[PDB]
Coordinates of C-alpha atoms and ligand atoms in Angstrom, one line a residue:
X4 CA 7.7 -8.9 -27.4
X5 CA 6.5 -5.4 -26.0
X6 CA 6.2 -3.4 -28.9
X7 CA 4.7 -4.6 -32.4
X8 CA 6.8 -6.2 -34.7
X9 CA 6.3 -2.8 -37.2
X10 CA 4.3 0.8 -36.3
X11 CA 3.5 1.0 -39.5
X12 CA 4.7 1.2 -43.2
X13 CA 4.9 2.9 -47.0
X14 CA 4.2 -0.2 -49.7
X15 CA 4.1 -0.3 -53.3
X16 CA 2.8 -3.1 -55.6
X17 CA 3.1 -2.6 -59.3
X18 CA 1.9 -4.9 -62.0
X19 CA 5.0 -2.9 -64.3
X23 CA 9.9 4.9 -55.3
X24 CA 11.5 7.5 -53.0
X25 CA 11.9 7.1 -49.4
X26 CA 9.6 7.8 -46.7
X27 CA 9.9 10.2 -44.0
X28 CA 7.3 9.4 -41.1
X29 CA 5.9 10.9 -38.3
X30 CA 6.4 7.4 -36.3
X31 CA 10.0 7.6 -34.7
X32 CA 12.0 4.5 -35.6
X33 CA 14.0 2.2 -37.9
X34 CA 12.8 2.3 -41.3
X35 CA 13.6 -1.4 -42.5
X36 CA 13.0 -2.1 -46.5
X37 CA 11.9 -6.0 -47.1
X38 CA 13.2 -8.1 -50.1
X39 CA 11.4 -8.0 -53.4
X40 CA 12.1 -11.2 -54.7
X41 CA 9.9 -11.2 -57.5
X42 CA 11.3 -7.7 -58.3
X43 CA 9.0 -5.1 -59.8
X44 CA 6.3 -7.9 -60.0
X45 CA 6.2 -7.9 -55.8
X46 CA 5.5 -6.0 -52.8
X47 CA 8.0 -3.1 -52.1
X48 CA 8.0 -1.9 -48.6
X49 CA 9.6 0.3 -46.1
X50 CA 8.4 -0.7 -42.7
X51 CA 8.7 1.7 -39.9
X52 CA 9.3 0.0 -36.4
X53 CA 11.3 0.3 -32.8
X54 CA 15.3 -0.1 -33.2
X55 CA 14.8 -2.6 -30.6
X56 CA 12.3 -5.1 -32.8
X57 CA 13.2 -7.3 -35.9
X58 CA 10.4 -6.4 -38.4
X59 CA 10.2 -9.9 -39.2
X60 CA 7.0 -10.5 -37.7
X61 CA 5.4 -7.8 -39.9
X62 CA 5.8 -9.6 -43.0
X63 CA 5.0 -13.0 -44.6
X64 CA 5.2 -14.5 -47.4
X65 CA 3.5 -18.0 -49.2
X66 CA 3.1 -19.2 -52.5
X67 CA -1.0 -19.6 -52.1
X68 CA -3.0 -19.2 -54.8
X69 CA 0.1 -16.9 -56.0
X70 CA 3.1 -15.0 -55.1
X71 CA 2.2 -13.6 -52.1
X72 CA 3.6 -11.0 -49.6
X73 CA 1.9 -9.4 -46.5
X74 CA 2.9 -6.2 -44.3
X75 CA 0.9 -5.6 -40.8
X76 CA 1.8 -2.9 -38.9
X77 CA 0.3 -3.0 -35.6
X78 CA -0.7 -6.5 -33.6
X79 CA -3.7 -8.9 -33.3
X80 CA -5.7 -9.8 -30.0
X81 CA -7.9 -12.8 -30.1
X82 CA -4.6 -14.9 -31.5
X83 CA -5.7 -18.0 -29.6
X84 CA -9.1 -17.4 -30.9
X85 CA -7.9 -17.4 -34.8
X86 CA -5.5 -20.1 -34.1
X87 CA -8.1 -22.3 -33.3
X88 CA -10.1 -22.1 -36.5
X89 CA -7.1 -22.8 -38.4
X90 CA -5.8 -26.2 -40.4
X91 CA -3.3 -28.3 -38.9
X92 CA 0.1 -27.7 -37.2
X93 CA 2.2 -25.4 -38.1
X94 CA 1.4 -22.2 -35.9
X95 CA 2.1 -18.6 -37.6
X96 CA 5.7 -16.8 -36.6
X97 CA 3.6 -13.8 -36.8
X98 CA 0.3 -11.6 -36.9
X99 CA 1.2 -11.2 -40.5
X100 CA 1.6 -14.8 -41.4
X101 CA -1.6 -15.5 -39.2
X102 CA -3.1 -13.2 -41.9
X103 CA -2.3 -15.1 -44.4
X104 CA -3.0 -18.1 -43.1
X105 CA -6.7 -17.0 -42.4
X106 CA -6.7 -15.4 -45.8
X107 CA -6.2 -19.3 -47.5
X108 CA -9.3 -20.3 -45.3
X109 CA -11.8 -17.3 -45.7
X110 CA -10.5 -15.2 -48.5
X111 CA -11.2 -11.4 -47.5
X112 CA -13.4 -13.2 -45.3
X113 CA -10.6 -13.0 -43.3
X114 CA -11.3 -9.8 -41.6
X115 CA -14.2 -10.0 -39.9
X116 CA -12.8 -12.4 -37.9
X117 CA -9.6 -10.2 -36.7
X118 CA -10.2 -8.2 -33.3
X119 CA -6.7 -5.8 -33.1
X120 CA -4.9 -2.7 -33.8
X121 CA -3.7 -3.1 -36.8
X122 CA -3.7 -2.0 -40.4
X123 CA -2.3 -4.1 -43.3
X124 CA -1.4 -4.7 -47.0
X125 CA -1.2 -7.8 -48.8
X126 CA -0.2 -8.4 -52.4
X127 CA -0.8 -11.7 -53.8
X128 CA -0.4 -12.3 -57.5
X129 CA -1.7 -8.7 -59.6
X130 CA -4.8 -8.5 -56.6
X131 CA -4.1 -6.0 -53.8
X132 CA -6.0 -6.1 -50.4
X133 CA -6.0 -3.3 -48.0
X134 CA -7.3 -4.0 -44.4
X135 CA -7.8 -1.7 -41.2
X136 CA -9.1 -3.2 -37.6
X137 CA -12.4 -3.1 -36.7
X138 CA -12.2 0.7 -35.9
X139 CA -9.7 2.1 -38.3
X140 CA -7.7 2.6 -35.1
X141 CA -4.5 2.1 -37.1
X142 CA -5.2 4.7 -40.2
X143 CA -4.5 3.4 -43.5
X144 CA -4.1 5.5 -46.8
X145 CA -4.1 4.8 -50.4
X146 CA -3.6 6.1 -54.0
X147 CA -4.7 3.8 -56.9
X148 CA -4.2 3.8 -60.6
X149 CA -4.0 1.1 -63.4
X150 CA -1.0 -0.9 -62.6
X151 CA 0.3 0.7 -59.4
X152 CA -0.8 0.8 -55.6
X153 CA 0.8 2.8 -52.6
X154 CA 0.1 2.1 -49.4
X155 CA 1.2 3.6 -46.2
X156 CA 0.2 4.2 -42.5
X157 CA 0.6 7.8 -42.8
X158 CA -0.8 10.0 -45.5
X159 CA 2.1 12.4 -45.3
X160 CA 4.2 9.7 -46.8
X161 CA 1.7 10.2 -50.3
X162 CA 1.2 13.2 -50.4
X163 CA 4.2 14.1 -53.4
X170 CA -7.0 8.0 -59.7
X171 CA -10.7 8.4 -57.6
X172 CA -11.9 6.0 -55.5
X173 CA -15.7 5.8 -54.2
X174 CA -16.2 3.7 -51.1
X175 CA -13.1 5.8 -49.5
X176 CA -13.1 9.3 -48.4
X177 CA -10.6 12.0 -49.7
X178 CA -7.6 13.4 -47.5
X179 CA -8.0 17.3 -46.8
X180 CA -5.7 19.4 -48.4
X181 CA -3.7 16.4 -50.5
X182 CA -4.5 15.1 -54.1
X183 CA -5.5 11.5 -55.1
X184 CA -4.5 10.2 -51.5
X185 CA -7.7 8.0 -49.7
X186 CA -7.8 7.1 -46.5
X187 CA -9.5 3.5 -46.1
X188 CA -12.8 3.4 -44.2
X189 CA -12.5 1.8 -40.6
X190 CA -13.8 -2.1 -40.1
X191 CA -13.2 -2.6 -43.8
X192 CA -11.4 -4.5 -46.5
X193 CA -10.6 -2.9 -50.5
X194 CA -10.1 -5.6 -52.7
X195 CA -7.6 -4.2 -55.9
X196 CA -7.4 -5.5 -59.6
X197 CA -3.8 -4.4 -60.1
X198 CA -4.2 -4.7 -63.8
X199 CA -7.3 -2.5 -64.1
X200 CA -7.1 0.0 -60.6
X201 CA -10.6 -1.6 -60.1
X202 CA -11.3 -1.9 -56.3
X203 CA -14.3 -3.4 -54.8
X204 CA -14.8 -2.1 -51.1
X205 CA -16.5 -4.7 -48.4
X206 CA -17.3 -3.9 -44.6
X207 CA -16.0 -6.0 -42.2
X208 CA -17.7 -4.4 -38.7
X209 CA -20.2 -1.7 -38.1
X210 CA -21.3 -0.5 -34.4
X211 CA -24.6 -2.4 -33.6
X212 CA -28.0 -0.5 -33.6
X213 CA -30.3 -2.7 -31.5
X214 CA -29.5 -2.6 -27.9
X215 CA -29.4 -5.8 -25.1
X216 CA -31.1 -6.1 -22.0
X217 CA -29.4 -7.9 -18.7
X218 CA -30.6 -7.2 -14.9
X219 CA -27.1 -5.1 -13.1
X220 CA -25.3 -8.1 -11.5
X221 CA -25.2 -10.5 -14.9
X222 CA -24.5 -6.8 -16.8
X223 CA -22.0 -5.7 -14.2
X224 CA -20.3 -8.9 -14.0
X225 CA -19.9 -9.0 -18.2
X226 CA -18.2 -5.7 -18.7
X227 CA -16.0 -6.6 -15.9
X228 CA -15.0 -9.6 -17.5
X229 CA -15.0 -8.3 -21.3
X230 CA -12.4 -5.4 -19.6
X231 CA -10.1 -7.6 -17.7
X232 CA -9.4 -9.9 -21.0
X233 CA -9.2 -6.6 -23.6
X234 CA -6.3 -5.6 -21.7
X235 CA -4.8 -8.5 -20.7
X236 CA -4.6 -9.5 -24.3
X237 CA -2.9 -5.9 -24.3
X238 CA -0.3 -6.7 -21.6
X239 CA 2.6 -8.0 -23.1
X240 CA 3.9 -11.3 -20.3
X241 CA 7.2 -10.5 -18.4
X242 CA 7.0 -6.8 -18.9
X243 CA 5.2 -4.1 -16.6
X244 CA 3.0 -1.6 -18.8
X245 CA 2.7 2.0 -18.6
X246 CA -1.1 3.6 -18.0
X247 CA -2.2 7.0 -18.6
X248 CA -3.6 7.4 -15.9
X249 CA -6.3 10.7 -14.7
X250 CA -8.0 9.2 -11.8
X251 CA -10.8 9.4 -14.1
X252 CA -13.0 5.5 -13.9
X253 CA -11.8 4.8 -17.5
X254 CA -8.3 5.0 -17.3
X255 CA -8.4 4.0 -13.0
X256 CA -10.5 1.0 -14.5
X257 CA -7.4 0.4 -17.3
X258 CA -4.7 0.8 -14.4
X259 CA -6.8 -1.7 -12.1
X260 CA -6.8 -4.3 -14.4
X261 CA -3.7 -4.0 -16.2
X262 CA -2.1 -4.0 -12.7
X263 CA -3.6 -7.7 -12.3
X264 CA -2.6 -8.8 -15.9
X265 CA 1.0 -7.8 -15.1
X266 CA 1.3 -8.4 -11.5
X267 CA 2.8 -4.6 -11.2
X268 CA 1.6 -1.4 -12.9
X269 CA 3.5 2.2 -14.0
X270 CA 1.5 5.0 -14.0
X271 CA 2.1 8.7 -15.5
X272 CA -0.4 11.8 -14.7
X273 CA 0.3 14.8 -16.9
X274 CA -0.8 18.9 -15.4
X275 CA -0.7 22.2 -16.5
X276 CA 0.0 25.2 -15.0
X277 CA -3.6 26.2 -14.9
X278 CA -5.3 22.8 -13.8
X279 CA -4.4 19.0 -13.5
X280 CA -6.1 15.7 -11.7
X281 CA -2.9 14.7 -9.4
X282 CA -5.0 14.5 -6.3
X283 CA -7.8 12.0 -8.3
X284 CA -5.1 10.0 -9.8
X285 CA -2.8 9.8 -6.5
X286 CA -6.2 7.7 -4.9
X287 CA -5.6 4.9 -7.5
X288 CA -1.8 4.7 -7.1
X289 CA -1.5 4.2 -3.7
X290 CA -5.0 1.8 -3.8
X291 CA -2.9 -0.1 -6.5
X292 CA 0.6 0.8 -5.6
X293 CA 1.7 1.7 -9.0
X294 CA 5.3 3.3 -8.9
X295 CA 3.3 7.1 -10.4
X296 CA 4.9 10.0 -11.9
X297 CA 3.5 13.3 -12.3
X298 CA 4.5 15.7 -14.9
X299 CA 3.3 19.4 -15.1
X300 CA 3.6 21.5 -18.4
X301 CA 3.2 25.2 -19.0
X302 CA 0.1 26.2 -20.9
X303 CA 2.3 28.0 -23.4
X304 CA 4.4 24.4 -23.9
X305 CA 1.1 22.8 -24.8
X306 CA 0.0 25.2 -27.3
X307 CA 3.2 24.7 -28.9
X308 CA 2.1 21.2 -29.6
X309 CA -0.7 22.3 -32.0
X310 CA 1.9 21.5 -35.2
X311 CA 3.1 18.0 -33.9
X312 CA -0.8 17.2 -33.3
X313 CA -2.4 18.0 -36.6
X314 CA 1.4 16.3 -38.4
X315 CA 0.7 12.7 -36.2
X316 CA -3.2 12.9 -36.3
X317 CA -3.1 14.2 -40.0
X318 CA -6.2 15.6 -39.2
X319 CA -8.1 19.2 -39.5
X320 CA -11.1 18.6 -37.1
X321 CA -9.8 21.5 -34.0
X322 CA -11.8 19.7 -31.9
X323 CA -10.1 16.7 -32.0
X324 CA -6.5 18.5 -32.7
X325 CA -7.1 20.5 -29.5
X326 CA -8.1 17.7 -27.4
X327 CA -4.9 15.7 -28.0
X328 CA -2.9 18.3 -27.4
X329 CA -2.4 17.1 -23.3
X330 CA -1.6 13.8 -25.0
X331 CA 0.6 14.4 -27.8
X332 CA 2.5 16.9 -25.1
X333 CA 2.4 13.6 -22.6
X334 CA 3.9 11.2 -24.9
X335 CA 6.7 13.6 -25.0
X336 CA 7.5 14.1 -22.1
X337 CA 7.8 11.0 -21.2
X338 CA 11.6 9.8 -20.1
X339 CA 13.5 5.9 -20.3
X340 CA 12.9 3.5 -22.6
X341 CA 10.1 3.0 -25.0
X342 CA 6.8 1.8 -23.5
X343 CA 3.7 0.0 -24.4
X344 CA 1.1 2.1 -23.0
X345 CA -2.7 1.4 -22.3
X346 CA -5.1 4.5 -22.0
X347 CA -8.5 4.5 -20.8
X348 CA -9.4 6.7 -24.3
X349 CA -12.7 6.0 -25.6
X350 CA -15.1 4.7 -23.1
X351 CA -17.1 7.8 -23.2
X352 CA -18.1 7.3 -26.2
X353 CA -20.4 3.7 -26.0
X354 CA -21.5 4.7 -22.5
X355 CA -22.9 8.4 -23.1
X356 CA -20.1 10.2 -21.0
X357 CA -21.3 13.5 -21.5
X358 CA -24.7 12.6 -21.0
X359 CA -25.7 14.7 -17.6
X360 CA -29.9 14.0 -17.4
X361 CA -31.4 10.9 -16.0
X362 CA -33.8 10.9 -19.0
X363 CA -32.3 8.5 -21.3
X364 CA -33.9 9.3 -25.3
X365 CA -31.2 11.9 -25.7
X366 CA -28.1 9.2 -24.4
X367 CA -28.7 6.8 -27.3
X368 CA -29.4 9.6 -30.0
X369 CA -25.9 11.1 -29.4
X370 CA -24.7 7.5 -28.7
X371 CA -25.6 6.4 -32.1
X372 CA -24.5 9.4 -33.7
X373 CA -20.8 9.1 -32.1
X374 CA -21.0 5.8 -33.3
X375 CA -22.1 6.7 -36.8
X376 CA -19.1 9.5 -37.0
X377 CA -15.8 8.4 -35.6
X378 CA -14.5 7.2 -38.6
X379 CA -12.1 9.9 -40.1
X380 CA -10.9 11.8 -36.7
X381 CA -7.9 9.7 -36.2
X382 CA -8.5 10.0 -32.3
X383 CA -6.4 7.1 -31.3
X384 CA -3.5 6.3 -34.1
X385 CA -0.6 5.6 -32.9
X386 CA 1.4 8.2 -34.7
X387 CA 0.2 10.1 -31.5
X388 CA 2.9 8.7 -29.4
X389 CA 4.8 6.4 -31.7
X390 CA 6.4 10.3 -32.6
X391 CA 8.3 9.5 -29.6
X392 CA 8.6 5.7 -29.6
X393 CA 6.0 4.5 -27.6
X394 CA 3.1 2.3 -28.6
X395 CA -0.3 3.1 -27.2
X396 CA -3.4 0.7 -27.1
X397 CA -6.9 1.2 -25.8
X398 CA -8.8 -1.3 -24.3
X399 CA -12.1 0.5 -24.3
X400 CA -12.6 0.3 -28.2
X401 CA -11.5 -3.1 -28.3
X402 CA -13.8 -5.3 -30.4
X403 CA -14.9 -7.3 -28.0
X404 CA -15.7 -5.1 -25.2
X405 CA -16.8 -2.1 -27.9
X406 CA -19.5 -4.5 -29.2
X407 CA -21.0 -5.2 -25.3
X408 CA -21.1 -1.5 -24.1
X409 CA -22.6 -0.1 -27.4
X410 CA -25.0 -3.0 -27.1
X411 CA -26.3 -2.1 -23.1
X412 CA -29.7 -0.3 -23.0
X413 CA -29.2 3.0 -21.7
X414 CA -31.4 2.2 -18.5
X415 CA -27.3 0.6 -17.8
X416 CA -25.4 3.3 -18.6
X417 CA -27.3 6.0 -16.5
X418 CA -28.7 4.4 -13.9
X419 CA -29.4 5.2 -10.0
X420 CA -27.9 8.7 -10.8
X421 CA -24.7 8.2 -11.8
X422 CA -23.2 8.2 -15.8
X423 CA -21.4 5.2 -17.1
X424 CA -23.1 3.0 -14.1
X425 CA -22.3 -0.2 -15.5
X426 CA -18.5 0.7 -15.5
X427 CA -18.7 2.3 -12.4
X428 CA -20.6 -0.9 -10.7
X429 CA -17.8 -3.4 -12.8
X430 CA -15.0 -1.6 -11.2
X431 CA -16.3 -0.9 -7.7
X432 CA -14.1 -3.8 -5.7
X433 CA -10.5 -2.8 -7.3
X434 CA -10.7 0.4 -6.9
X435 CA -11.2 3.2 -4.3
X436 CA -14.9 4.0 -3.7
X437 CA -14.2 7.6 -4.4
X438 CA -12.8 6.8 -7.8
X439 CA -15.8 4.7 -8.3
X440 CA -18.5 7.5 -7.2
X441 CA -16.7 10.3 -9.2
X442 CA -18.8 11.5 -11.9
X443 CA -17.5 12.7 -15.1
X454 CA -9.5 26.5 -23.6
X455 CA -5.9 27.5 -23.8
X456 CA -6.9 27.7 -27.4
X457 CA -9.7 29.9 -27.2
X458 CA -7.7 32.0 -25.2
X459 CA -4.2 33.0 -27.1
X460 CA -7.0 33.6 -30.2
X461 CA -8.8 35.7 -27.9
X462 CA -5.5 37.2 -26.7
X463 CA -4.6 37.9 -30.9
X464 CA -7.8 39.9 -31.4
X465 CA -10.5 37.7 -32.4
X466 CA -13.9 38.4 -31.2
X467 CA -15.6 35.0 -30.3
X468 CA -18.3 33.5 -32.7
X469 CA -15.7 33.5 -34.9
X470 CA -12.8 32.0 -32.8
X471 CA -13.7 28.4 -33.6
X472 CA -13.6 28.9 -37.3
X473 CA -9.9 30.8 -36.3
X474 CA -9.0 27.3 -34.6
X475 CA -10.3 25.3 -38.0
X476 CA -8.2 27.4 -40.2
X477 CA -5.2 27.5 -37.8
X478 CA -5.3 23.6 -37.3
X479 CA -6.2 23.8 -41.9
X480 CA -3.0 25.7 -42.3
X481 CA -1.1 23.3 -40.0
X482 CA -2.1 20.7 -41.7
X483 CA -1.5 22.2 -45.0
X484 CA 2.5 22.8 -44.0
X485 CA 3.1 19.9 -42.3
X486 CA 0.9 16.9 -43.8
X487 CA 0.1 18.5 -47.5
X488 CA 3.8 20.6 -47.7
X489 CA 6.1 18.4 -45.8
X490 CA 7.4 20.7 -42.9
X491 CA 8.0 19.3 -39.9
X492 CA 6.5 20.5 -36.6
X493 CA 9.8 22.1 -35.2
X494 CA 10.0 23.9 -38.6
X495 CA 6.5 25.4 -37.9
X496 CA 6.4 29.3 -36.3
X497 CA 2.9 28.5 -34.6
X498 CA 2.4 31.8 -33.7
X499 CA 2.4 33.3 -36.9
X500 CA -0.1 31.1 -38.1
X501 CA -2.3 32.1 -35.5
X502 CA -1.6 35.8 -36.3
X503 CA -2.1 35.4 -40.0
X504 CA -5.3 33.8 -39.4
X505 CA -6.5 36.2 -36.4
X506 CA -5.9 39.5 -39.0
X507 CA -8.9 37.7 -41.0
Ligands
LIG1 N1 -3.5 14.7 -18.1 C1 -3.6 13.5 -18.3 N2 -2.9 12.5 -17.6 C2 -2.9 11.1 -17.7 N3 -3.7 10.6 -18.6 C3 -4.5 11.4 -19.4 C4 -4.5 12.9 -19.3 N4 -5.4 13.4 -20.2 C5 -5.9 12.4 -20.9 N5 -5.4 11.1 -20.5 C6 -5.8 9.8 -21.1 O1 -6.8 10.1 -22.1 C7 -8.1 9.6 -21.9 C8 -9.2 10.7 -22.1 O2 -10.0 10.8 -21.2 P1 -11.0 11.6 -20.2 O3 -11.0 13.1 -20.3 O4 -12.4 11.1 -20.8 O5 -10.8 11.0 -18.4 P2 -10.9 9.4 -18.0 O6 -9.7 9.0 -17.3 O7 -11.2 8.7 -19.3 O8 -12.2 9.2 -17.1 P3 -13.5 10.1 -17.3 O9 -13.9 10.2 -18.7 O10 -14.6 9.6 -16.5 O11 -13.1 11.6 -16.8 C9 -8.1 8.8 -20.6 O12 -8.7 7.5 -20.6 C10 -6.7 8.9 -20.1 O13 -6.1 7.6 -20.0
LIG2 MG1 -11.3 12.5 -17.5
LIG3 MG1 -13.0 9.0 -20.6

């Protein structure tokens, strides 16, 4: 029960198709079409070690009906309880469904996870992502048929308004985070409805009440995240987000694995080594060369799918982590994300500026594909991020900024939450390669970040839009074809 029943999936429904080839490392499982062309197709994509049977569900409610999750749910006690009588769900996908017969669509705004699914019942087609698309979702529509997959690269060999446009690829829409497309098979109609949206007003509380709530929010995201009976793994920096993760994942589990990840030209060992011997974690520390990372830049842009370099070249460390890593697979929670509610680049103690740039972020993270899985599902692991979970998302978004930066120090309220697990250092801490090897293949600099937007473009364009994969991909050519420009 450590890793998701399915990572994620290719589906076709058709009122009246070629197999997949996914970034996600697994078993590629196809599910029964009983009601033959008139079903639910499906490849789902999953772990060797885990039946896919959890991942889909089927009923004969208000029609034929089939439903594919990929990913899990984390309030399931929560959804349980609002259900009618007895029978309790196998699986997040069957809970789907089962929520589906009481609020329709409705469903939706109700679910707090990492998911992304696709349900099919009778010629209407629904298409769901979590509250913060953290689990990207694509589509292509047309009268009579609808394909659906966790990975855009699986389309890309009709317009839709409401969803944006992949880069590079034709007809292929990625569905909007926190959101819910409703499908008339028959017609390629689709009616788009938003399930979640980052709150705009902003909640007062004196420090201890304030300090005691993001403690608590925290210690239940990622206990929800802990799977019972198995130690997790934590990305850990020595950084308060991911130290606050480790601290209380170790409590959830009992134990706690940690991993730090270096360069040749910098790492955070020394910060990190604090929390593992404050938390006796069993820690491992794994350095790669500078000229390793940049080789990532391929496998990046093919498991994010995306051509923002400034999101491509800030999970490079990551992507390189996840493959490094050694044993079995892992569920993995990451401190990724807090920055963002709690202004962690904000450096004054005047506030205005925190919430403009926090509302902002808030108003533009839909798209960048910062935390899919496909990041370290490439190599078999499942990642999760308690930060951005629904639940705790909603609170620090919500905290007036006085809580945030407060008595000199950025992301106080975290910092105060996490001050008795946690070494007092860790707790006071406050918060290219890239540039360079463009620099190195002369490129004068105003121009080097529009070099890195049509390096990562041209990436993109082999990999996601051609269907190249990563190893396949001379990175250093690119680079030179684009630097002679
Ligand atoms: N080299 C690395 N080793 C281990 N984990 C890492 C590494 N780089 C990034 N991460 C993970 O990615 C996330 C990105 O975060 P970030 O640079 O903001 O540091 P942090 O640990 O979050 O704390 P802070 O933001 O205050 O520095 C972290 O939460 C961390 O879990
Ligand atoms: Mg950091
Ligand atoms: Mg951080």
């Amino acid at each position: 029960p450590v890793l998701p029943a399915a990572f994620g999936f290719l589906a076709s429904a058709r009122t009246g198709a070629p197999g997949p080839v996914f970034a996600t490392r697994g078993s590629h499982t196809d599910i029964d079409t009983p009601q033959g062309e008139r079903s639910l197709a499906a490849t789902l994509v999953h772990a060797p070690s885990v039946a896919p049977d959890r991942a889909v569900a089927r009923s004969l409610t208000g029609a034929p009906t089939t439903a594919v999750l990929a990913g899990e749910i984390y309030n399931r006690d929560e959804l349980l309880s609002v259900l009618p009588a007895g029978p309790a769900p196998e699986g997040d996908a069957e809970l789907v469904l089962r929520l589906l017969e009481r609020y329709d669509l409705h469903a939706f705004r109700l679910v707090n996870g990492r998911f992304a699914t696709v349900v099919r019942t009778g010629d209407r087609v629904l298409l769901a992502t979590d509250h913060a698309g953290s689990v990207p979702l694509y589509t292509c529509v047309a009268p009579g048929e609808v394909r659906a997959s966790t990975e855009a690269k699986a389309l890309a060999a009709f317009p839709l308004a409401d969803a944006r446009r992949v880069a590079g690829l034709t007809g292929v829409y990625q569905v909007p985070a926190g959101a819910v497309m409703d499908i008339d098979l028959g017609s390629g109609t689709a009616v788009t409805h938003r399930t979640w949206t980052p709150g705009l007003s902003r909640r007062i509380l004196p420090e201890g009440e304030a300090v005691a709530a993001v403690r608590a929010a925290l210690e239940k995201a990622v206990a929800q995240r802990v799977t019972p009976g198995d130690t997790p793994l934590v990305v850990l920096s020595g950084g308060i987000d991911s130290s606050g993760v480790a601290a209380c994942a170790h409590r959830a589990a009992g134990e706690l694995d940690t991993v730090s990840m270096g360069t040749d030209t910098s790492n955070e060992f020394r910060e990190a080594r604090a929390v593992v011997d404050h938390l006796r974690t069993r820690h491992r520390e794994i350095t790669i060369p500078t000229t390793e990372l940049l080789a990532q830049l391929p496998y990046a842009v093919w498991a994010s799918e995306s051509v923002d370099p400034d999101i491509i070249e800030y999970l490079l460390p990551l992507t390189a982590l996840y493959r490094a890593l050694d044993g079995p697979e892992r569920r993995i929670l990451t401190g990724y994300g807090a920055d963002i509610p709690l202004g962690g680049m904000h450096r004054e103690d005047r506030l205005p500026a925190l919430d403009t740039v926090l509302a902002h972020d808030m108003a533009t993270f839909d798209g960048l594909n910062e935390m899919s899985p496909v990041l370290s599902t490439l190599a078999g692991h499942w990642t999760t991020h308690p930060y951005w979970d629904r639940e705790v998302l909603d609170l620090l978004v919500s905290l007036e900024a006085g809580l945030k930066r407060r008595h000199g120090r950025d992301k106080w309220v975290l910092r105060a939450a996490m001050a008795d697990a946690l070494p007092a250092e860790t707790v006071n801490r406050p918060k290219s390669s890239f540039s360079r090897l463009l620099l190195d293949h002369g490129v004068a600099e105003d121009r080097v970040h529009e070099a890195k937007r049509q390096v990562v473009r041209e990436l993109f364009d082999l990999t996601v839009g051609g269907g190249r994969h990563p190893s396949e991909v001379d990175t250093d050519d690119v680079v030179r074809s684009v630097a002679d420009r």
